[PDB]
Design a protein around this ligand. Sequence first.
Ligand SMILES: Nc1nc2c(ncn2[C@@H]2O[C@H](COP(=O)(O)OP(=O)(O)NP(=O)(O)O)[C@@H](O)[C@H]2O)c(=O)[nH]1
Length: 294
Amino acid sequence: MFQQLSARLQEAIGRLRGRGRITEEDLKATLREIRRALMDADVNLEVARDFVERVREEALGKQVLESLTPAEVILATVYEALKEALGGEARLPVLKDRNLWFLVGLQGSGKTTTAAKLALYYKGKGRRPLLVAADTQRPAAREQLRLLGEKVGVPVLEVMDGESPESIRRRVEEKARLEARDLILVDTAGRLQIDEPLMGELARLKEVLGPDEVLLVLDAMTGQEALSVARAFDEKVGVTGLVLTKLDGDARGGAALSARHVTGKPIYFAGVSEKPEGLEPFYPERLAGRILGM
Ligand SMILES: Nc1nc2c(ncn2[C@@H]2O[C@H](COP(=O)(O)OP(=O)(O)NP(=O)(O)O)[C@@H](O)[C@H]2O)c(=O)[nH]1
């Protein structure tokens, strides 16, 4: 997945095993390599510096200098940092009796796609999802989700042009009632850049609908930019969880490894393909070990 950084963090570590015992000087050289790999992987400079410093201390604490095989100690420490950096323990939205989630993000984020992926994912977990195209301005946008739902066998309610939040709430509540939906997914309008008027309307909707979760969908290939947007969305509307899409095309992994510190939000899911099935719960442990070959 993160082959680039992987192969990179590999030479750095693999450059210590066959040596047999290592000196602090050699350790600093390795850490610099590691630190450079992270920066080159678009990892928030701050996160990258902290990472290597953490590895340094942890490494010394593990008596690395006093080891017949340091390359391994450095491996365990670096794996621990990646794991923590990625989020630590795996998390997932907690489902209740009835759930109503919002999907937010900018255009080309994978938002709408992820919307169907969630409906399909939870449809196979014994849920009855309802997809809703919340874009009140563009009919072509609601149309893209109407098709997707038709593809994953999940009903879709499309709001009207300029429909009010209350009207949308009434309509959505009634459908869920008559069709027995327990998971209600609201795909909100996707725009190129942050649109203040839209945020206002999303805030009002958030107020009228009262979503249990507000998932912001970010395209992982946009690097650190996805984090500045995540902050914007959190400050302007309010985020509860993240979804990293296009991770299969993500050669660096800067956004993934920086979301924790930068946004302080948990990454619930990871997009791994353009197909409705291309979704899976975010597993920090998995990726951490994967990046190192563990
Ligand atoms: N490789 C890959 N492509 C993805 C993934 N998720 C979505 N895509 C692709 O990215 C493109 C944009 O997705 P999407 O955001 O749903 O399209 P949009 O019309 O901009 N809708 P929105 O308003 O929600 O942003 C689509 O061509 C979709 O197939 C993923 O996990 N991996």
